[PDB]
């Protein structure tokens, strides 16, 4: 129906908005006919009245259909269209391994990513530290890589969920961003555009988590499962730990390198391994590529050990303009910094605390990302050989190994790192890597 | 404190905003630094959390101080600075008589009016049907008229309560206009700028009332008394009837004429008389010009009968550039329409119902006001000899006498009037003119 004022009022007076009404409002948001104030007002009424399951699904759908919705029916692929989604994290490089691994098991992953300006090391920028990697293939080319290779990590060709652009921008300045119904629809809008069959949300918990409390991370996880499954996509979610860096490194080139050494068994961080394996099992199960966890973990460990996984990564990289021999000779292609020195904590002890966001911002500030846009990322700067909680430190074990441009910013970051990692006289109680699985 | 987002959140989470915080927000509204969405958001949080008495007063004060606040201390006047405020109505010409009457009793009335674009026949346009009437005297000239004459009805020299400009505009399209705390502060902002000592709100009740229900008109009346008196101005309010036209005419020239025949006792509509007397008694009492109702009604009836009141009207008109003999020879100065014919209802009976808003819009539509701004009011068009509820009608008594430009718009209005006044086989139950007096 018509009138933005009309719609705002209904919801304000504790009523449920119709699909036609929610759809009308969202397009108006996209077509710039519905003002900022009209957006901020509706967001608030939702913050006080919430939205029923039907309203929740209609909001998401009307946002998905705001832009373009991919369809792979014509391609007649012989496998499930699946993909994973995270709420971000520092060292969260699971996507580079996840994509190849699941494609090597019969799954098609049309990973339309979107970096993460603000304070989030998107994967798109990591993949750009690979000489020639084109993250912008046209539709027809993209459709080809998927069918041929199985995976493809590309940047959003804008027209995905446009309404979310204005809706989110307003919410950020009007104090209505922390509203579960709105968040749920915002996150899934982009993904549900990919024309998926199944999905898996990786909801982080802890200091570096999106939601403030475990109870709130869990809350969001349950909401996501509901509307996605309501929208037709077999979804499950996991609560991953993010109280420290996931991989043994944070940056761009250093992370893509880590993803290669993982795929080839040259080195595998155990925590990164658990989360990586846990997400893939879900995708296989949701995708029907396995009847149970045991079957799935089996197939995955195989592909990971017979080199078939790293092979797919290598085929994905080449099809997107990277070297055709990236996995074998990556050390000659990836950018190496001028200064690489290890940093040590002031005293001997056990790592008991760590501010992920701090380390995250330490990376950006040293060139690892962009605070504005005009900034140009130094794809070689970052951290490696990161200390894990519980690790005893001293002259034998530094906190991390810093890859900086010069002795100055090295020194800067060195102080940043040392300030972000808290020591203690004794090792803290351990926490799980994968807390639990929300489903149905 | 800083941040509009910060402030919005606090209030959203059921907290009380500080004076410094409310003040910061309001100036930002004025200085265009606080966006539409940030205004619409805060308005909603208030619609759901209301505002404590302290917050209520701080909002109004921060809005008053948004612009200029008059001060009459330097003038050293020998009387109270008072003024009345209405929520509008059709035929509500009480201000033209009220101003003179109270000044003739020792009260100073710096009536900064402001017409009423939209659907409200402001007094400013009525006073402009008087040849040469200048409603825009400069401060020094204005200050002179007050001290010399005692009264002065002038248009707002913009810089009064600027914040209210943007705040109200946003609210109108975001469904947050019907919020008592916001209304209370909006109305009083303009008035409290006049540097008053006492005030009296004329809150209408009925079909032509601002608030939807008697219980809501009363609700607003109690709120107004609270924050005004909290802000230092001795305030009381009355619930006037507005289920029909107050004066025996609606328009511009026809109303100013009515106000003159009242002041000179040539004719006095009894309902208009009661409301006019009721409001003045309040001003005298609040102003300290009387110890009780009896004393006040006495002084007023005197000034009304010894011609001293009409004298003041005459001195006000002349000081503001109108004729120096307007009261004695008004019939030669006021605009007279080309067509003046009486309209009769289709059948004999008793006037039982009447849509004030309809008659109000009938006047505008015939040139009595402006729907846009570029329109130029025909200060001669309007209704006179209006039927009162309970009046029996037939060939002896028409519904009203229409002053139109031509036979066309006369005919138009004639249908408008006839459609707005409902007849019945028997006279309806009478209602009071003045329902009750809210105080303290």
UniProtKB/Swiss-Prot annotation, chains A, B:
The keyword Transferase applies. It catalyses: thymidine + phosphate = 2-deoxy-alpha-D-ribose 1-phosphate + thymine. One of its GO terms (biological process) is DNA damage response. Pathway: Pyrimidine metabolism; dTMP biosynthesis via salvage pathway; dTMP from thymine: step 1/2. It is an enzyme of class 2 (transferase). GO terms for cellular component: cytosol; membrane. The keyword Glycoprotein does not apply. Keywords: Glycosyltransferase, Transferase. One of its GO terms (molecular function) is 1,4-alpha-oligoglucan phosphorylase activity. It comes from the Bacteria. Its EC number is 2.4.2.4. Coiled coil: none annotated. Gene3D superfamilies: Nucleoside phosphorylase/phosphoribosyltransferase catalytic domain (3.40.1030.10), Pyrimidine nucleoside phosphorylase-like, C-terminal domain (3.90.1170.30), Transferase, Pyrimidine Nucleoside Phosphorylase, Chain C (1.20.970.10). Pfam families: Glycos_trans_3N, Glycos_transf_3, PYNP_C. Homodimer. The enzymes which catalyze the reversible phosphorolysis of pyrimidine nucleosides are involved in the degradation of these compounds and in their utilization as carbon and energy sources, or in the rescue of pyrimidine bases for nucleotide synthesis. Belongs to the thymidine/pyrimidine-nucleoside phosphorylase family. NCBIfam families: PRK05820.1, T_phosphoryl, Y_phosphoryl. This is Thymidine phosphorylase. It comes from Escherichia coli (strain K12).
């Amino acid at each position: 129906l018509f009138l933005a004022q009309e719609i705002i009022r209904k919801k304000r007076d504790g009523h449920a908005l119709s699909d036609e009404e929610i759809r009308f409002f969202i397009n108006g948001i996209r077509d710039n006919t519905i003002s900022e104030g009209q957006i901020a007002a509706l967001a608030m009424t939702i913050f006080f009245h919430d939205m029923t399951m039907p309203e929740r699904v209609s909001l998401t759908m009307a946002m998905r259909d705001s832009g373009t919705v991919l369809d792979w029916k014509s391609l007649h692929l012989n496998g499930p269209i699946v993909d994973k989604h995270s709420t971000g994290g520092v060292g969260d490089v699971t996507s580079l391994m996840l994509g190849p691994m699941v494609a090597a098991c019969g799954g098609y992953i049309p990973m339309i990513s979107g970096r993460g300006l603000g304070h989030t090391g998107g994967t798109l920028d990591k993949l750009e530290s690979i000489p020639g990697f084109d993250i912008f293939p046209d539709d027809n080319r993209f459709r080809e890589i998927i069918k041929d290779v199985g995976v493809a990590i590309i940047g959003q060709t804008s027209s995905l969920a446009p309404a979310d652009k204005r809706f989110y921008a307003t919410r950020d300045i009007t104090a209505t961003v922390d509203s579960i119904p709105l968040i749920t629809a915002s996150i899934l809008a982009k993904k549900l555009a990919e024309g998926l069959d199944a999905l898996v949300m990786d909801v982080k918990v802890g200091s570096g988590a999106f939601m403030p409390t475990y109870e709130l991370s869990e809350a969001l996880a349950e909401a996501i499962v509901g509307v996605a499954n309501g929208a037709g996509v077999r979804t499950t979610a996991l609560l991953t730990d993010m109280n420290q860096v996931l991989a043994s490194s944070a940056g761009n080139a250093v992370e893509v390198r880590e993803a290669v050494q993982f795929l080839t068994g040259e080195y595998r961080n155990p925590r990164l391994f658990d989360v990586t394996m846990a997400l893939c099992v879900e995708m296989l199960i949701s995708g029907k590529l396995a009847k149970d966890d045991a079957e799935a973990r089996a197939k995955l460990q195989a592909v990971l050990d017979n080199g078939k996984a790293a092979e797919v990564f290598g085929r994905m990289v080449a099809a997107q303009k990277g070297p055709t021999d990236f996995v074998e000779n990556y050390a000659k292609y990836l950018p190496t910094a001028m200064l690489t020195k290890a940093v040590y904590a002031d005293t001997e002890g056990f790592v008991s605390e760590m501010d992920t966001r701090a380390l995250g911002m330490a990376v950006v500030a040293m060139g690892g990302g962009r605070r504005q846009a005009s900034d140009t990322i130094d794809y070689s700067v970052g951290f490696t050989d990161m200390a894990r909680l519980g690790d005893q430190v001293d002259g034998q074990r530094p906190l991390a190994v810093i890859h900086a441009k010069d002795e100055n910013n090295w020194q800067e970051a060195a102080k940043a790192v040392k300030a972000a990692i808290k020591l203690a006289d004794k090792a803290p109680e351990s926490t799980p890597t994968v807390y639990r699985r929300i489903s149905e």
